[PDB]
Every structure is written in C-alpha cells, then in structure tokens.
Design a binder for this molecule. Structure first.
Ligand SMILES: N#Cc1cnn2c(NC3CC3)cc(Nc3ccnc(-n4cnnc4)c3)nc12
Length: 331
C-alpha cells in the first residue's frame, strides 16, 4: 500500500517561500547573447548531451568554455540555465557567462568561465592529506550553498570538479542533472554515474533530496583517501548495491527498506544475500596510510549511510574535526 514519504531534514521549504519564477523553469524565457563574440579554439571533451570547447571572447580576449548542447528536451535546457542563473556568484559554483545559439544550426550553447584544471587522474595522486581536506571543504561550500538555494546537483563526482591547484581554486561544474527540491516530489532515479549512485537510487526510492549529494561526496572521499578509484565498483546497477552491501553490511540495508516500506526489485533477492558491516581498516594499506586518519574515517562513516535522513548535512560536515586545520587556516 505504498512507500513511506520523506522530507529533507534541512532547507525543506525553501523553494515554497520563493516567487514561482525561481523554480518554475518551464516559464523561463532565455536571454540570448551574440554567438559572434566567441571563437572556438579547440575541443576539450564530450558528454552525453554536449561537446565542450575552449573559446575566446573576442571583445575582451578572455578565455572561456563553451558547452554546445546536443538536442535535449527544451525543458531540460531551461532547467540547467535557470539553476545556473540562480546559483551565480555562489561559492565555488561555475559562472555562466553567456548563452548563445548558432543562427543557422539553431543548436544552443552555454558559455562558462574558464578554470585552469589539472585532470584528476594526474592530480589526485599528488594530493596530500591536507589538500584532500581543503578541497573537500571547498566542495561542501558549494553543496551547502546550492542546497540552501533549493537545488540538488545529483551528479557529484570527480569529473565535475575543476581544480586550479596553482591558485587553490575549485569550481563545481555540470549542472545539467541538477533539480529543484520540492517536498513531496518523486524524482527520476536514473541519475548520476553508477559508481556514485546512492542506495535510494539503486532500490528505486523516488522521494529523495539534497542528501543524495552527500552520499556521492562520500564515494569521492573514500576513493581519494584509500587511493581506490572507484571505491564501489559495481558491474551494473544491481551489483552496485551489492558492492555497497559487502561494505555497509546487509543488516542496515534491510532496516532501511523496512523503515521506508520499499518494494525491493525481485532480482535483488538472489544476489544480495547476507553480509557483515566491515571496518574501514580493511581498506588501509602502507601506500594510502598517510591519507587515512581516525577523523577521516569518522567523517566518511557519517556520509556513507543507507538512510538518507541519517547522513551529515553539508553544514554539519563542514563542522567535523577533519576540517579543524582548514577552518583555523582560513582565519
Ligand atoms: N564548465 C566548465 C569548465 C571550466 N573550465 N573547464 C575546463 N578547464 C580545463 C583546462 C581545460 C575543462 C572543462 N571540460 C569539460 C569536459 C567535458 N564536459 C564538461 N562540461 C559538461 N557540462 N559542463 C561542462 C567540461 N570544463 C570546464
């Protein structure tokens, strides 16, 4: 007779108190700049819904990044744009600088500030214990901000974090999966990269919230401190939950599904089984030990919970002892 509802613990009603225009993005009319202000220098990457390029703004000679959209429902384009406009100027959020359209193709393109990134496959190996703490704090600033502005990112993962290590500068990018949180709303669970999916997505619980992002942050942290990328390495969406169960154990999994009355896919019946909750030490070794501390593990344990209501908020995470060195240094 149905699954049990959930409300976010924090920033629950923030969009309700706003003018409709703020979250009702289908009514947003898009303000188009001049496509001839930007000349593409070279391709930077691909996506599911985009091709990305370095470009020059010829009026100021500023370097710029251009995300040319593949055909996607116009609703989804207005959402990314609206979300980006709402968040502009927020801490460690990428700045949307312009929106242009090819006058012939009619293909839309988003123009962003350039960050002098160093790709994470090279950067993460160089990273000290202190660096991980510093950049994790920087990410949490962005997440607390967007959550406080009524927005879930829903795609937090290393590819979506730009770090200019030289200037100790971080930007959270790709708001193309992001959505507005409204209490009661049932969301698409076919979101996020497999390795970063929260249990709520994996068991098809739709009434999820900001805390989804905190799970994915936990996945990031785990891979960085344990130097194991990715941390939960499922073969598919089913085996992804099993890879999690083999670590957080099945006891809390079934208490979770019980608490929310979740109709578990029949196909999980075979493969899930019974597994104990492991201790973090099973993942410590001499190569990664210098990154691992009791603080780090305490923090990680409080991100990585099945029950979304029981995970740390961004603000609570920022107040954790793991960050005391960082908070002191920022004053
Ligand atoms: N936004 C943004 C942004 C800023 N600097 N920077 C850089 N800087 C590096 C020196 C080159 C690379 C990059 N790359 C990609 C690749 C693939 N997808 C995206 N993307 C998808 N949706 N939004 C962005 C970005 N994106 C960005």
């Amino acid at each position: 007779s149905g699954p049990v509802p959930s409300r976010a613990r924090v920033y629950t009603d923030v969009n309700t108190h706003r003018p409709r225009e703020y979250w009702d993005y289908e009514s947003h009319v898009v303000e188009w700049g001049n496509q001839d202000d930007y000349q593409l220098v070279r391709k930077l990457g691909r996506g599911k819904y985009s091709e990305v390029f370095e470009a020059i703004n010829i009026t100021n000679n500023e370097k710029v990044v251009v995300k040319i959209l593949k055909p996607v429902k116009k609703k989804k384009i207005k959402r990314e744009i609206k979300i980006l406009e709402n968040l502009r100027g927020g801490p460690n959020i990428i700045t949307l600088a312009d929106i242009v359209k090819d006058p012939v193709s009619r293909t839309p393109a988003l123009v962003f500030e350039h960050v002098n990134n160093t790709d994470f496959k090279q950067l993460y190996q160089t990273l000290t214990d202190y660096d991980i703490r510093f950049y994790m704090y920087e990410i949490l600033k962005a997440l607390d901000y967007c959550h406080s502005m009524g927005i879930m990112h829903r795609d937090v993962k290393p590819h979506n974090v730009m770090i200019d290590h030289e200037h100790r500068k971080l930007r959270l990018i790709d708001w193309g999966l992001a959505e507005f949180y409204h209490p009661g709303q049932e969301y698409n669970v076919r979101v996020a990269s497999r390795y970063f999916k929260g249990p709520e997505l994996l068991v098809d619980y739709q009434m999820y919230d900001y805390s989804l992002d905190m799970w994915s942050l936990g996945c990031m942290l785990a891979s960085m401190i344990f130097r194991k990328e990715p941390f939960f390495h499922g073969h598919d969406n089913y085996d992804q939950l099993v890879r999690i169960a083999k670590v957080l154990g099945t006891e809390d999994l079934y208490d979770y599904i019980d608490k929310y009355n979740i109709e578990l896919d029949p196909r999980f019946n075979d493969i899930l089984g019974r597994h104990s909750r492991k201790r973090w030490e099973r993942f410590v070794h001499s190569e990664n030990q210098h990154l691992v501390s009791p603080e780090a593990l305490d923090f990680l344990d409080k991100l990585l919970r099945y029950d979304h209501q029981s995970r740390l908020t961004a603000r609570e995470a920022m107040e954790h002892p793991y960050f005391y060195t960082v908070v002191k240094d920022q004053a």
